[PDB]
Protein backbone atom coordinates (compact mmCIF):
# COMPACT_ATOMS: atom_id res chain seq x y z
CA UNK A 1 0.00 0.00 0.00
CA UNK A 2 1.96 3.08 -1.18
CA UNK A 3 0.92 6.56 -0.01
CA UNK A 4 1.95 9.58 -2.08
CA UNK A 5 2.31 11.40 1.28
CA UNK A 6 5.18 9.02 2.22
CA UNK A 7 6.75 9.17 -1.22
CA UNK A 8 6.62 12.96 -1.04
CA UNK A 9 8.22 13.26 2.42
CA UNK A 10 10.89 11.55 4.55
CA UNK A 11 10.04 9.88 7.82
CA UNK A 12 11.50 12.71 9.94
CA UNK A 13 9.43 15.37 8.14
CA UNK A 14 6.26 13.29 8.60
CA UNK A 15 6.87 12.57 12.30
CA UNK A 16 7.58 16.25 13.06
CA UNK A 17 4.31 17.21 11.36
CA UNK A 18 2.48 14.36 13.16
CA UNK A 19 3.64 15.33 16.66
CA UNK A 20 2.99 19.02 16.02
CA UNK A 21 -0.56 18.46 14.87
CA UNK A 22 -1.26 15.94 17.67
CA UNK A 23 -0.25 18.60 20.19
CA UNK A 24 -2.13 21.47 18.48
CA UNK A 25 -5.46 19.51 18.24
CA UNK A 26 -5.49 16.81 21.01
CA UNK A 27 -9.17 15.91 20.42
CA UNK A 28 -8.43 15.07 16.79
CA UNK A 29 -6.42 12.49 14.92
CA UNK A 30 -4.44 13.19 11.75
CA UNK A 31 -5.33 10.86 8.89
CA UNK A 32 -3.80 10.56 5.45
CA UNK A 33 -6.54 9.52 2.98
CA UNK A 34 -5.65 8.49 -0.58
CA UNK A 35 -7.24 6.47 -3.37
CA UNK A 36 -6.00 2.91 -3.63
CA UNK A 37 -4.20 1.89 -6.85
CA UNK A 38 -6.46 0.60 -9.66
CA UNK A 39 -9.48 1.98 -7.80
CA UNK A 40 -12.51 3.05 -9.85
CA UNK A 41 -13.59 5.96 -7.62
CA UNK A 42 -13.14 9.74 -7.75
CA UNK A 43 -9.94 11.14 -6.42
CA UNK A 44 -9.62 13.29 -3.30
CA UNK A 45 -7.78 16.57 -3.97
CA UNK A 46 -6.69 16.81 -0.31
CA UNK A 47 -5.09 13.97 1.61
CA UNK A 48 -4.52 15.42 5.12
CA UNK A 49 -7.54 15.27 7.45
CA UNK A 50 -7.97 16.12 11.11
CA UNK A 51 -10.84 13.93 12.35
CA UNK A 52 -12.57 14.13 15.77
CA UNK A 53 -11.51 11.26 18.00
CA UNK A 54 -15.04 10.32 19.04
CA UNK A 55 -16.26 10.12 15.45
CA UNK A 56 -17.18 6.58 14.49
CA UNK A 57 -15.36 4.98 11.61
CA UNK A 58 -18.71 4.70 9.80
CA UNK A 59 -19.35 8.43 10.08
CA UNK A 60 -15.81 9.07 8.82
CA UNK A 61 -16.69 6.80 5.86
CA UNK A 62 -19.69 9.03 5.15
CA UNK A 63 -17.64 12.24 5.31
CA UNK A 64 -15.07 10.96 2.79
CA UNK A 65 -17.90 9.50 0.63
CA UNK A 66 -19.45 12.99 0.41
CA UNK A 67 -16.03 14.54 -0.50
CA UNK A 68 -15.78 12.27 -3.52
CA UNK A 69 -19.43 12.92 -4.51
CA UNK A 70 -20.67 9.36 -4.09
CA UNK A 71 -24.02 8.22 -2.75
CA UNK A 72 -24.45 5.70 0.06
CA UNK A 73 -25.53 3.19 -2.64
CA UNK A 74 -22.07 3.33 -4.32
CA UNK A 75 -19.60 0.56 -3.55
CA UNK A 76 -16.86 2.12 -1.39
CA UNK A 77 -14.35 0.38 0.91
CA UNK A 78 -11.66 1.72 3.23
CA UNK A 79 -8.39 0.10 4.25
CA UNK A 80 -5.97 0.45 7.16
CA UNK A 81 -2.93 -1.83 6.99
CA UNK A 82 -4.73 -3.70 4.13
CA UNK A 83 -7.76 -4.66 6.20
CA UNK A 84 -11.15 -2.98 6.39
CA UNK A 85 -11.62 -1.37 9.87
CA UNK A 86 -14.61 -2.15 12.12
CA UNK A 87 -17.49 0.27 11.50
CA UNK A 88 -18.35 0.83 15.17
CA UNK A 89 -14.83 1.67 16.26
CA UNK A 90 -14.07 5.28 17.03
CA UNK A 91 -11.49 7.14 14.98
CA UNK A 92 -9.52 7.60 18.23
CA UNK A 93 -9.41 3.85 18.80
CA UNK A 94 -8.42 3.14 15.16
CA UNK A 95 -5.68 5.83 15.46
CA UNK A 96 -4.37 4.44 18.76
CA UNK A 97 -4.40 0.90 17.32
CA UNK A 98 -2.93 1.65 13.86
CA UNK A 99 -1.05 4.95 13.72
CA UNK A 100 2.48 4.65 12.30
CA UNK A 101 5.67 5.92 13.95
CA UNK A 102 5.17 9.31 12.25
CA UNK A 103 1.92 9.73 14.30
CA UNK A 104 -0.36 9.50 11.22
CA UNK A 105 -3.17 7.07 10.52
CA UNK A 106 -3.08 6.03 6.84
CA UNK A 107 -6.36 5.15 5.10
CA UNK A 108 -6.85 4.07 1.49
CA UNK A 109 -10.21 3.81 -0.29
CA UNK A 110 -11.41 1.78 -3.26
CA UNK A 111 -14.48 0.51 -5.03
CA UNK A 112 -13.29 -3.08 -4.44
CA UNK A 113 -13.18 -4.91 -1.12
CA UNK A 114 -9.56 -6.01 -1.67
CA UNK A 115 -6.91 -3.27 -1.67
CA UNK A 116 -5.26 -3.01 -5.04
CA UNK A 117 -7.87 -5.02 -6.97
Amino acid sequence: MKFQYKEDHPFEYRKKEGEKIRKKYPDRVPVIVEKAPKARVPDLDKRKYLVPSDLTVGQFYFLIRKRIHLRPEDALFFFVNNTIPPTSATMGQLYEDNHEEDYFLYVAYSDESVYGK
Binding site: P30, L55, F60
Partner: peptide, 6 residues
Protein backbone atom coordinates in the same frame (compact mmCIF):
# COMPACT_ATOMS: atom_id res chain seq x y z
CA UNK B 1 -3.13 22.53 4.81
CA UNK B 2 -5.34 20.18 6.83
CA UNK B 3 -9.09 19.65 6.31
CA UNK B 4 -11.09 19.51 9.52
CA UNK B 5 -13.87 16.94 9.28
CA UNK B 6 -17.00 17.73 11.34
Amino acid sequence: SWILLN
